[PDB]
Design a protein around this ligand. Structure first.
Ligand SMILES: NC(=O)c1ccc[n+]([C@@H]2O[C@H](COP(=O)([O-])OP(=O)(O)OC[C@H]3O[C@@H](n4cnc5c(N)ncnc54)[C@H](OP(=O)(O)O)[C@@H]3O)[C@@H](O)[C@H]2O)c1
Ligand SMILES: NC(=O)c1ccc[n+]([C@@H]2O[C@H](COP(=O)([O-])OP(=O)(O)OC[C@H]3O[C@@H](n4cnc5c(N)ncnc54)[C@H](OP(=O)(O)O)[C@@H]3O)[C@@H](O)[C@H]2O)c1
Ligand SMILES: NC(=O)c1ccc[n+]([C@@H]2O[C@H](COP(=O)([O-])OP(=O)(O)OC[C@H]3O[C@@H](n4cnc5c(N)ncnc54)[C@H](OP(=O)(O)O)[C@@H]3O)[C@@H](O)[C@H]2O)c1
Lengths: 287, 287, 287
């Protein structure tokens, strides 16, 4: 049977980026839908579970995407709720590539760290967006003491509460309104991630270079000025007098390979569920 | 040339069910459109008839679907009306699966009856919907005496008139507003079909198992309480005393293979027209 | 990698005609979007330039189409504007088949004229539409002396100004408000093209067959009354006395083959820009 991927996007039209990667990952055909909601996705799912049987079923799979993570999460939950008994197919969630980007970034840092980050302090700057929250979640799951920062304490605390409930961890928040506060929050930390919006700087070279404790820095922003000063986007473990760095493009290379590999995995079984935990498990096997 | 199927759906977005079946039927690519109407479909059809010539033409085809049978029929007529001379391609109509469902059901019953039902009495309970109407048409074309029943003579006689004019047959109507009247209507019948809306019982175990004249019963409702009591939805010719029963899922298994086979036929010529009659002819071959 | 074509149509839904030709031109997959504007196309383009690298870049391409040429040009310019450095893919513009139609027409006439029209006079009747304007541009590029006519001088001059600025040529405009003026305008001309709206006659038989200077005539209107009287739409170099005629269908046959061949070119490099000039270059090779 041909491998058919059904793309459910919460935005008005399906993401072009997700279509290309889906095909390069092995889909024979991709059929996409926009404006997908928790109320209209059930009928679409029925079409994937009552049309093929047995080993044929694994050749159909579902991918959920779009620009708003919370919206994708509501659709993803409604998809899983429609399945019942043996009537199911594999599914994946990766709105705006946040799960694959956060998983690639954390896997690279944990590997470069020797394989463990337990008990160590980790700081995610501008960690209130989807990549920062998923990054905080995966680090916390690895045992690190995570502090999620943002300009305003309420938003920062809301993000940690959200992450804590979903992944059952205990991330703490902190307000850092300026570069100065951001320099302080970083003191005593062993790992520092900058998950800021595109084209903004958050931690100049001084701010991280003179902190004996810092082992690794990782930046998700690929547009200059970069989130971390003193490094290049292509950096991928590059040495900087003690500290090692991973730039956005070095992280991006793995994210792309990871996304492709997850798509292929969707067709090897009819019961895969790929959200942050499972995507990160695969990321560690590929880093 | 690649086998290209153009899917025209009357609902807001195209049916996922119809997409999977189309690829398993052999289409190389399926391009779908939602909110298709009798007015906008003409321009879509031009794209299928003026882009390929000669032997190439049979490699493009059209499929009309959606949840409303009436809307689908209006669009299908607009499609056939657009063709002119040699400028045409094969087309199929199967809104809400009404044609393939009714064709599989009748084909299975006629086969289990020995191959001929000429002159026998067949009763279709709640036969005023698309599935009941198409079933009555096909039975009447096979020569059976058909009585289409519903809660109000008004609507039942209109359903019968519609079928009679479209298929050139002579189905009669009858009013059965309650259990008792329903049980009464099946006396003396050889074949009984329940084509009621989903989740409703129309013929309890005690209304058919004690009528000697009845040879075969068939139910299209797959949601408990089933249309026929005393059987399982998966029954496919299972014997109950001296009678045989077909459950909605037993019928559905053939409906799926039939729907796949019809799509493949669309690419074997550029003049095929697959509506109830032709879909039924193929159903008999495969039953 | 699979050859992926992304279709951006300015209308509500993507053209069926453009999809079929795109597959016959060699695309492995076509993903179409409707309602595309200069504003929302940027995010779409990003998806085609950040998902593949190196030799895989050329396996993704863009096609802009739809019914309104002006809307299409705006989107096409926005697409080229999003590219930067090596981050780009091949792209093509053919809203309403205006580029492939004008290129096929001019190529056929130039070949029939011995391969050169330099220094000769070409008149384009009702040349204010997109087909008429593109035809005038290619003819002027061949060194012909071109006169673009229309019922009102201001509109005709605006058309020539547009063409002259865009292709850097020097087409002249003239007002021909009635039958008498159109007949006067072609006296002494060597080539006459009728690019009027569908179903209108612009050049009666007696208005061209008695003019000794006229060598070849071409008509883009396929709906009777044809733009040029006394010819058949299927004519493709048919001789009438000392003259050759090309009708709308004779021209359309090359347009179709040309459109297919252009799509194939898009995947041969990641820098192709298929607008009128490059499409005409290929038309000459194929006429
Ligand atoms: N290439 C890929 O495949 C890919 C995929 C996904 C993401 N990414 C990249 O990874 C990064 C993370 O994405 P994201 O979507 O999670 O980010 P986001 O939601 O756009 O922004 C992250 C946070 O940055 C903070 N911020 C915004 N403007 C700021 C300013 N002027 N000063 C200080 N803080 C500011 C906000 O935190 P507070 O308001 O709490 O301060 C915001 O929650 C982005 O740079 C994005 O480009 C790349
Ligand atoms: N799995 C598939 O591929 C597939 C495809 C199509 C259909 N189906 C199933 O097959 C059946 C037929 O579909 P359909 O669309 O023709 O049905 P429908 O139009 O939904 O219903 C059929 C008839 O049921 C009668 N009815 C409604 N409520 C009733 C009640 N409370 N008591 C008695 N009669 C009642 C009505 O007739 P009166 O008003 O005249 O009494 C109505 O015309 C359904 O169960 C449907 O789920 C399955
Ligand atoms: N088969 C294909 O692939 C294909 C594709 C595209 C176009 N075409 C055909 O080629 C032709 C050119 O298309 P187009 O889009 O450029 O045309 P258009 O924009 O529809 O019309 C061209 C010009 O015709 C003139 N006109 C309109 N009504 C007129 C009338 N009643 N009397 C005299 N002149 C009138 C107008 O010029 P003024 O107002 O300046 O006088 C108008 O600008 C059409 O016949 C079309 O069907 C075929």
């Amino acid at each position: 049977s041909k491998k058919l991927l059904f793309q459910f996007d919460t935005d008005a039209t399906p993401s072009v980026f997700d279509v290309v990667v889906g095909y390069d990952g092995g889909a024979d055909h991709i059929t996409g839908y926009g404006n997908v909601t928790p109320d209209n996705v059930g009928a679409y799912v029925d079409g994937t579970i009552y049309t093929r049987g047995g080993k044929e079923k694994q050749s159909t799979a579902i991918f959920v995407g779009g620009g708003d993570m919370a919206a994708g999460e509501r659709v993803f939950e409604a998809v899983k709720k429609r399945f019942f008994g043996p009537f199911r197919v594999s599914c994946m969630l990766d709105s705006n590539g946040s799960n694959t980007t956060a998983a690639a970034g954390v896997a690279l840092v944990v590997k470069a760290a020797g394989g463990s980050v337990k008990g160590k302090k980790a700081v995610v700057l501008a960690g209130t967006g989807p990549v920062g929250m998923r990054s905080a979640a995966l680090l916390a799951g690895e045992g690190a003491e995570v502090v999620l920062c943002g300009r305003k304490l309420d938003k920062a605390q809301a993000a940690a509460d959200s992450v804590n409930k979903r992944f059952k961890v205990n991330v703490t928040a902190a307000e850092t309104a300026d570069d100065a506060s951001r320099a302080e929050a970083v003191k005593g930390a062993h790992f520092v991630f900058t998950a800021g919006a595109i084209g903004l700087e958050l931690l100049p070279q001084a701010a991280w270079q003179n902190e004996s404790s810092i082992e690794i820095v990782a930046d998700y922003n690929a547009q200059p000025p970069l989130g971390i000063g003193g490094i290049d986007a292509t950096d991928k473990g590059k040495e900087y007098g003690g500290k090692r760095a991973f730039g956005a493009l070095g992280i991006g290379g793995l994210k792309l390979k990871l996304h492709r590999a997850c798509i292929a995995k969707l067709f090897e079984s009819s019961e895969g569920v790929f959200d942050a935990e499972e995507i990160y498990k695969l990321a560690k096997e590929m880093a």
